[PDB]
Amino acid sequence: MKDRMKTVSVALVLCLNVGVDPPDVVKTTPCARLECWIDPLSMGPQKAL
């Protein structure tokens, strides 16, 4: 396997606008807003991100 092309860099682009629900969101009871095993509501809009 002479073709040994590899990944060099990773771009992480996040749009986790904590506290803002787009107008097409259905909410809320079962929302389970757990992201990376984090519940943003316990930290606030900046620390959580």
Add this chain to the structure above:
Amino acid sequence: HTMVVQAITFIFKSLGLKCVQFLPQVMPTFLNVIRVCDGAIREFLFQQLGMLVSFVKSHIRPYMDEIVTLMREFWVMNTSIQSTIILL
């Protein structure tokens, strides 16, 4: 009974998904009415419950524990109620 139920269904349809806020007030009574109403109107109530569930979609969750019991108690193999329950 019939006119009140029809009015409630119409209101939910007109409101759209905004109507979810009214479930804690309507469902605890509606189900009890089904439990105690006369058979002459129970079929109508099942048909309207069907439409109500269709309008509120996934938010019906906490009430299924009772809805399934009402569905089972009245499934007496009567062709008419069978068709209504199957659609529900």
